[PDB]
Design a protein around this ligand. Structure first.
Ligand SMILES: [Mn+2]
Ligand SMILES: [Mn+2]
Ligand code: NA
Length: 346
DNA sequence: CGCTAGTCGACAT
DNA sequence: TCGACTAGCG
């Protein structure tokens, strides 16, 4: 997530209700509903005790969407991106830590703080997600498991015209170049909408409303793929991109000390990390629902070599990609754990 | 003013 | 998990 982005472009935000998308299709970052639903039953989940409260929690959101004549496409996270394995491990350590020390806090008597310990140990597994998938598909609601991060898949679904809006809590969608993003939606449909074309309402944003420059801004400020240079936030990065009339971002980053009047040393591997971040935001592998084939988020440009983009995910056979996307194949064991067929009755 | 790093709440009784 | 919020510091 782009920390502070939502407050940085608040002028482009608008309080809405989902009724305005009646008769249209809306994709959903289901992992947020999964997490907020897991919070209610974090105790049983952390203990391994059987529960399915989060299923109902997600399904009342889904039902709420269905009640207003909206077609929801639930999208789920798939395989972990190779550039975040260390990160996921480092987070898993914290989860297990809060789990154990949570159990010890239960041993010592306080539960209100122990609650706060168990709520930070929540690990959304693919099994839970699959439970939600079955629960939704029993209602005729489409479900699609992303090849990797659901962010890029959602971005594709929106930029292709399959859906007209995206329900999420993560601002990464804005960096992926989404047209419309619905944030902070409760059980009743009251949410906050951000339009890409409305980014012009932000005065301090300057002329950084174009998708490319906006992406550059989000990356330079600091994202999940690359940590920002110490002292570089959203405002200063935006200032750099505003003061830079040069289309070549590399020379700009090399002159980031010049555009800001600061003693900023730019390491040579930071440029590599930046290029990788941009290529990940641009060409992360998604799944085409129509053609049923692994494709990059955006079409490969004539300058970039697609052979050196393994950090954006590697390709597999389209059949395997299909069985993975349908949730029929386990992401980890690559074994058939289901046999859904959308044909015999996205 | 801007940025870093840490805290805190979410759900729900 | 992610944003909101804030003390501390350039
Ligand atoms: Mn995500
Ligand atoms: Mn994200
Ligand atoms: Na930053």
């Amino acid at each position: 997530g782009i920390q502070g982005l939502l407050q940085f472009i608040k002028e482009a935000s608008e309080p809405i209700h989902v009724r305005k998308y009646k008769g249209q299709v809306v994709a959903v970052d289901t992992y947020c509903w999964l997490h907020k639903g897991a919070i209610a039953c974090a105790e049983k989940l952390a203990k391994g005790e059987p529960t399915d409260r989060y299923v109902g929690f997600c399904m009342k959101f889904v039902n709420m969407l269905l009640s207003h004549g909206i077609k929801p496409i639930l999208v789920f996270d798939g395989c972990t991106l190779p550039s975040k394995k260390e990160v996921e491990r480092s987070r898993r350590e914290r989860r297990q830590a809060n789990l154990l020390k949570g159990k010890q806090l239960l041993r010592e008597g306080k539960v209100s703080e122990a609650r706060e310990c168990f709520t930070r140990s929540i690990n959304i597994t693919h099994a839970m997600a699959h439970k939600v998938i079955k629960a939704a598909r029993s209602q005729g609601v489409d479900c699609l498991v992303a090849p990797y991060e659901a962010d890029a898949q959602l971005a594709y679904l929106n930029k292709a015209g399959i859906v007209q809006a995206i329900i999420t809590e993560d601002s990464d969608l804005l960096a992926f170049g989404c047209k419309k993003v619905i944030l902070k939606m409760d059980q009743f449909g009251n949410g906050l909408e951000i339009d890409q074309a409305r980014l012009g309402m932000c005065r301090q944003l300057g002329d950084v409303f174009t998708e490319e420059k906006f992406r550059y801004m989000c990356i330079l400020s600091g994202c999940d793929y690359l940590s920002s240079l110490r002292g570089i936030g959203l405002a200063k990065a935006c200032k750099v991109l505003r003061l830079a009339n040069n289309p070549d971002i590399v020379k700009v980053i090399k002159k980031i000390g010049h555009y800001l009047k600061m003693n900023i040393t730019v390491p040579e591997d930071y440029i590599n990390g930046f290029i990788r971040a941009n290529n990940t935001f641009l060409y992360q592998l998604v799944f085409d629902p129509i053609k049923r084939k692994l494709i990059p988020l955006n079409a490969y440009e004539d300058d970039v070599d697609p052979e050196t983009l393994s950090y954006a995910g590697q390709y597999v056979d389209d059949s395997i990609a299909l069985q993975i996307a349908l949730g029929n194949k386990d992401i980890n064991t690559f074994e058939q754990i289901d046999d859904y067929n959308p044909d015999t009755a996205l």
